[PDB]
Design a protein around this ligand. Structure first.
Ligand SMILES: Nc1ncnc2c1ncn2[C@@H]1O[C@H](CSCC[C@H](N)C(=O)O)[C@@H](O)[C@H]1O
Ligand SMILES: Nc1ncnc2c1ncn2[C@@H]1O[C@H](CSCC[C@H](N)C(=O)O)[C@@H](O)[C@H]1O
Lengths: 260, 260
């Protein structure tokens, strides 16, 4: 069985306001992976909180989610167009908003007309996509707040797009699709389990993949993250896959990848 | 002069709740660096918001700051010891809490007894330090919320420690000290201006430096960030400085650096 003081620490994690919208099985998995590394379960709890913030919490806060909820409601009015204002509330979509036009111009012909699109670790990106005519996507994420907002917005707009819970460390999505998006995802997945990026890429049942990385440059060249991600990606990419194209849009390094 | 629509976009940034505690000169500098790269000043505004979130906002939210305020008040009662609970509210200090004992055991003999310590881009770290007997530090940061909390806590505890506003892209701190801490700082500084890390290290007026990097590992080895930071650091380190020691504590790669 489980130690009682360990369960109290896990309980503090599971009842935390900040984690209320993370998949509980993910919270538990992270904590149990860390629990054998600290003598004090309260130290495992702090370590799990940090881990969970790094992999999902930092992109969107708890009350910015209710704020995003109310903004997207004003967008379906068709007056406000605070659609930009809502998508600005998740760190990964706000990063993409200023280059979104360039991004769709350069990526959408790869996806194909009316493609069935899987958006893996989707955050709020399926709302951005859907606004730009890509309305047949299936998002998935461990952040049930993201999932909920996507489904609500899609049903209100008449999109076929939907989202569902998914922890990519314990599930390789089995859906069929024309394309899958792995945007700003592989580094944080590989941080959670060595080899997991290559295992995911080799097993997805979509012939075209869009894989992207953040270039954490902000006017200076930084420590060279873009080249480091590129080298790593080219080294782990399964031999069954081939890069069709590479380019950088608004501090996002984008790869168009084809199944050979 | 400045374009009026550009100033309206800057004004939206300067009046934003999320930025209310960032140094205004820093907000303006970031926006003016980006303003010549977008045709629409509202796109420069979104880009500046993203930049500013990456360099300072993501570590601590706006209301977690009032929460930290109320927790630290209960700690000076000497009953609650929610000191751990407050320091858990800034991402960089919560990362360090579980290894803090190991961290002080391994770093403090380098600082020296009753050292005068500069804490550059200090976040809430001077409160963590001060609790552990390092009570003569001068923190500095662009986050005036951090600065305010540090000064309030220090005066209530009787510490000599203080903090002040400082933008490390436009100022090389001129203070004299026994040691300076550059913790989880050089990558984000170098992302803002190429060469700025080496210029800062070569000009600080302290004979001992503690320089640290996040190892963004979470159970998997990720893309190899630790080795990448190590290689970069060894390449940019000014020849007037020498690494005395290196070790990793709680996903922080730590260098003890001596002026030769
Ligand atoms: N193990 C995991 N399984 C599923 N999603 C995960 C995950 N680890 C992190 N995530 C999700 O990965 C996302 C990283 S931010 C990238 C979001 C989106 N692809 C975009 O580019 O806009 C977060 O939404 C987080 O919830
Ligand atoms: N140009 C700049 N000048 C001063 N501080 C900066 C800065 N860019 C980012 N920062 C600060 O750098 C910090 C990075 S988080 C690291 C905080 C602290 N050293 C610790 O390890 O706990 C944030 O507090 C942010 O406010």
């Amino acid at each position: 069985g489980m130690d009682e003081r360990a369960q109290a620490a896990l309980d503090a994690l599971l009842s935390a306001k900040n984690l209320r919208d993370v998949c509980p099985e993910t919270v538990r998995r992270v904590f149990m992976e860390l629990l054998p590394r600290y003598r004090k379960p309260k130290d495992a709890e702090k370590a799990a909180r940090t881990h969970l913030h790094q992999i999902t919490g930092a992109f969107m806060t708890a009350d910015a989610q209710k704020k995003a909820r109310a903004l997207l409601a004003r967008w379906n009015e068709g007056d406000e167009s605070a659609l930009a204002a809502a998508l600005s509330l998740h760190a990964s979509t706000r990063e993409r908003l200023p280059g979104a036009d360039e991004w769709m111009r350069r990526v959408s012909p790869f996806l194909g007309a009316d493609a069935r699109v899987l958006d893996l670790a989707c955050g709020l990106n399926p709302i951005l996509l859907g606004s730009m005519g890509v309305t047949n996507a299936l998002g998935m994420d461990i952040h049930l707040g993201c999932v909920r907002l996507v489904n609500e917005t899609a049903r209100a707009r008449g999109w076929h797009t939907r989202a569902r819970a998914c922890d990519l460390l314990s599930e390789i999505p089995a859906e069929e699709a024309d394309a899958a998006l792995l945007m700003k995802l592989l580094p944080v997945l590989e941080a959670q389990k060595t080899g997991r990026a290559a295992e995911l890429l080799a097993s997805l049942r979509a012939p075209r993949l869009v894989v992207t990385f953040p270039t954490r440059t902000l006017g200076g060249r930084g420590v060279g993250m873009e080249k480091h991600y590129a080298d790593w990606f080219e080294r782990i990419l399964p031999d069954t896959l081939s890069v069709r194209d590479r380019f950088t849009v608004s501090d996002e390094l984008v790869y168009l990848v084809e199944r050979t």
